[model samples]
Target: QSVGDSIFPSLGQRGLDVQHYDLHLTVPRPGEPHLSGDVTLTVGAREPLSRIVLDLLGPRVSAAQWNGQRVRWVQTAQKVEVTLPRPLRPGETGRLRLIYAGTPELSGDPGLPIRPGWQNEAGLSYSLSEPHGTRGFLPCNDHPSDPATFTVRVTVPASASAAASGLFTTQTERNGLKTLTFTQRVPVPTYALGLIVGPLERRTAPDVQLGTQTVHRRDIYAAGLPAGTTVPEGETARMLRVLSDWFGPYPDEVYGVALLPVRQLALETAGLTTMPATSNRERVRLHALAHQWFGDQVTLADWADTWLSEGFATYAELLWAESQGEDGQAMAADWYARLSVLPSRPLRATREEEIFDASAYFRGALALHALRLKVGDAAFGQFLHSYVKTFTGRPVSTTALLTLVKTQLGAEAEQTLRVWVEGRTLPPLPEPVG
Candidate 1:
């Protein structure tokens, strides 16, 4: 919830007390009614809570309650909020339960999704966004900078299957409603949280070691690959191995991947990487895995230093490319040439940096490229190894990074990083040496 010039972890450091919330969501489509049930939420936070958001599947929702307490509730243009029984103290805990019902709604925008037979009009539908995917069909904090582990229970109609984005471990089918419980433990942002419900099936990918010690499980829910599309499983695995060797092991307890119908621009969320439906999913996967290190695990302390996340992620891919003895130099030269013509030329600024600009991504790549050039391979390698380890799960700013560089390579490196990152302009690229 915190970023910018301000210091963060604003409240998380003090920690939180827990309250519980249980939910039931029902979506009535044109032909059949889709339903999900029993989502429990623990009201966890450091301060006395003032507001809580619950996602609504309907175009418009009317009301909600906590433990039958007709509490004061409000809805913005985006969501329905239930105000708490006064803000709980720093240590106060709370519990809430909800029952939601809605009718199916689709998009007017040509880009929005629809059921297979839209003319006949069918299938469950929902919306998504950042800071608040409260519309993501989940009751949540809906903010990325803040994290909440969710114990999600989905109860879909007998014939429908519900799929969510996080680590899902259980499903039981007996009655008209099939209940699936997904306990997601990752510190995921709101945009990363997702749910897809309708007629769907799952196929588990064989667990193969891409370097994780205990064979981790991965599943691809492609009941069937669409016409003209084929997954390059062999090449994808080879690339995963290359990424593993370069970026090293992923953090936490497990590692997994999924291939879906999403030609999603830039891995929809940091929760997991998405592979663009391309022929070379392997090379693409390396870039995504590097993000697990830069963007996901160690996030930027502020938007101004977005390059630290994006630039580093891209740079890792280049490194992986170089290691394979691929034509990596040519690719980098082309990108650097491209970066030369950009406008406004700021290094990087958090998510605020527009995607197409690559200002944060490319420029930061250039910076890392320069660092390697200046310090020589040995020291630069050590710098990266230490940098990733030291900053794991930590947030860092451009200024803080400058300090780290100075400490490692003396004042010259620090000054160079600062000027390059914040100086609004750049020096001309030097001539290539013979």
Candidate 2:
């Protein structure tokens, strides 16, 4: 079996590491589903490698080139396997380009977790590829562990403005078309890539000053909002304080919130978080912003450890609520009590097809709350700040979290955490501490 054939945590080819992606995408016309692109990938050989497999679900590849010549390729339901012209020995590099076109099939509901793949409606095209759905559009070693730099050049009509992950470099207009360019220097997994095209207005949030050196610039891109609309003074800056106080400073140089039409869900795509344009609730926005520290900064190396992303963000939601005088503890207790009625499932997913379970959020956050009590708020805060700073821009497994928190929690706390994470049932809750 290939490395990617595991029952859980679908793997990709081993011994290859991607360095950068240069993508030139021609967006489909407004209100259409078609999209075409040319992606040039530069990969490095960590060991001897003759072939590489990349996940791809749509925008069917028309041709592939490697080393300036056409290369042998095969496409299945889930991936595209490319045979290199010559085996890349250790320390060597190779390049490949995929020319592809297709009408991306719509695959998500409005209120659900932004399902993977394209969501087209009216004149907007937004991508929500969580877990492993980025393969639906672009080809890549589709595991979260294989983070790489990305340069996206999205071409759209003059009426539309493009929003993507990372710093906006520049935009060029030619023959009634606009090409928006974004270069993400911070390495990120394919799942974190964000792309959107529509008639939108971009606004800058009043700078939230943590310190002179730590000032964070927030951007808001809203679709369908009338011009000259003043942003409602909300808790976005307060949410940043609550998270940064616990999880170190924000990891990215910029944080952009693109208010799309999608409902009830937001995606933490690197520095950019996409939300429904109509939903301005602080609870929802806080959860997505928390991911900037938890999910975007410290990513999951494998899908099994998804709790590191979701659970942490959920907890952040409660924490922010508590800061605003809501009963965070009662909410967590309610979640824990509700979880007992549901079918029991382990936090670490062993099946690739398992949809995100409630246990990951409720139980996962409950366990963290218990850990906070066991380790005391001081140590818990210290542990989180250290962990985020240490693993920033890096992917890690559950084992890494366990190891990192070991010293903070004594043997008793360690054993308590083990049962909480590895076992299926709920563990004993910690006593309330003032």
Candidate 3:
């Protein structure tokens, strides 16, 4: 029943190894829905690649060039397929510059968990690209398996602010215009890409100290709030400590939250996560924090393996609740009970739309808790730490995780995980240890 490789032929250009992306875009001031950008990509040839295809959607494709000469290229099937100057042999390197301009199209299957795309609402321009939405804004290998270091430069009105991925390098303003630069040297996937531009204010929070003694930065941004409006303070710091204690040091040098004027669920976008401007829910806060370790750092090989991100983050939230003491037990217990009745679905989605199914999070978390009970606390904890360290910034599959679980906890534990992940029927929860 799985869709198998059908999804691949549509999602990415096979045999193209991407290394980095240098993106520069000029966004319109709020009130005008407009976007245009140019991206230079550095890629390697896995085989004798004749043509390179990258996922790019929106507006007109002005031109594409390679080796400083305009080469043959065309936009077909919502992807830019470029004709290489010549075929590059195995392991050969090349560069490409794609020029495009137009209003970004909003595309996503909300039923499958992909958030709505770029919107200019109330004089604010914000874009959240998760799963497939990255192609809605820029061209690249729009799949989780292909991650690359990114450098983003944005031009906006001086009166507005823009937030993007990675560390802030510099901000320049001249004649009522602002140019902001952010460079994230670390390799990250397309879904983690984030961009927001609007009239906003920045609030800096205290640094969170990790076990390594390095302090991580924390900040919050939102449109026009009362001067003394109580923002959720100290929660991010507490999350940093708890996640650091369990998953090791924070992956990025800095971590912060951005409140966009949209009501969509918060997204973990690289070093900066995006929350809704109206919602201040603690669980949403905790879930996005867990992504720093589970989703942002240790990502999946493909969409089907989404449980690695969502399930792990959900479990992390429950674990955080438990750490808070008295109320923790009931919260954890409630999720366990709720998951028991959730409709059966494959943990690794066979269909593209099934990837974001609610069962993937709930049942996946239940399965993880069951494994914890079976493997005992020490080994389970060890597995979590090892998994994150082994695959940080890399894509991994459920099979790879099962292999590690097998070695540490034996075949019985491995089989239990396999069933819980691959089967349609939910397995009975592991008995509580007295």
Q: Which candidate number would show the highest lDDT if scored against the true structure?
A: 3
Tell me the tens digit of each residue's lDDT in model 2 across 74-189.
88876788888778788887788999888664335343355677667768887777766667667877777677888999999997888888778899999999998988877777
Candidate 1, RMSD to the unseen true structure: 5.8
Native-to-model Cα distance after best TM-score fit, residue 44 in candidate 3, in Å: 2.5
Off by over 4 Å in 1: 1-39, 46-70, 79-81, 91-93, 96-136, 157-159, 174-176, 198-200, 206-212, 223-231, 234-248, 252-257, 262-280, 300-305, 350-356, 429-434
Give per-residue lDDT, candidate 1, residue 285: 62
User: Which run of 10 residues does model 2 get worst, by summed lDDT?
Assistant: 1-10
Q: Estimate each model's TM-score.
A: 0.74, 0.89, 0.92
lDDT (CA) for every model shown? 0.52, 0.74, 0.75
Off by over 4 Å in 3: 1-9, 89-91, 213-215, 218-220, 225-231, 326-329
Error of 1 at 47 (Å): 4.4
TM-score of candidate 1 versus the correct structure, residues matched by position: 0.74
**What's the CA error at residue 312 for candidate 2, in Å?**
0.8
Better of 1 and 2 by TM-score: 2
Between candidates 2 and 3, the TM-score winner: 3
